[PDB]
Design a protein around this ligand. Structure first.
Ligand SMILES: Cn1c(=O)ccc2ccccc21
Length: 128
């Protein structure tokens, strides 16, 4: 029954993630940064994160709340802002997309997540 709650949370998180993942603006965030393509990445960004990995984490029951989930979404975003801070187009584009990923994710959750559902998730997690 609490099990039911987390399963529902997972169903909700997979759907939101799929909707972000098929958005063409967010293509760059769908897969881990390839270390051959970007050799120093794994040096600078201590905690890589991507939408692929977010899917795996959902399935590994790593998110017990929407808060936990959005921490990883924000981490996708802050990684991009930190790794790509320059004034050039390539960096400004990724940053702009990073911010849109973040805001879209929040906006979907704000319209579609019941807050009492979140609150329940939080209270079950707090009791374990
Ligand atoms: C997320 N990201 C970056 O933040 C920087 C370079 C890059 C290259 C290929 C794929 C993803 C990339």
């Amino acid at each position: 029954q609490e099990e039911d709650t987390f399963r529902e949370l997972r169903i909700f998180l997979r759907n939101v993630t799929h909707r972000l993942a098929i958005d063409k603006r967010f293509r760059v965030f769908t897969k881990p940064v390839d270390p051959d393509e970007v050799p120093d990445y794994v040096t600078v960004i201590k905690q890589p994160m991507d939408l692929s990995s977010v899917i795996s984490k959902i399935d590994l029951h790593k998110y017990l709340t929407v808060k936990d989930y959005l921490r990883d979404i924000d981490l996708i975003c802050s990684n991009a802002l930190e790794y790509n801070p320059d004034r050039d187009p390539g960096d400004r584009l990724i940053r702009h997309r990073a911010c849109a990923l973040r805001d879209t994710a929040y906006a979907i959750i704000k319209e579609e997540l019941d807050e009492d559902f979140e609150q329940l998730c939080e209270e079950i997690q707090e009791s374990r």
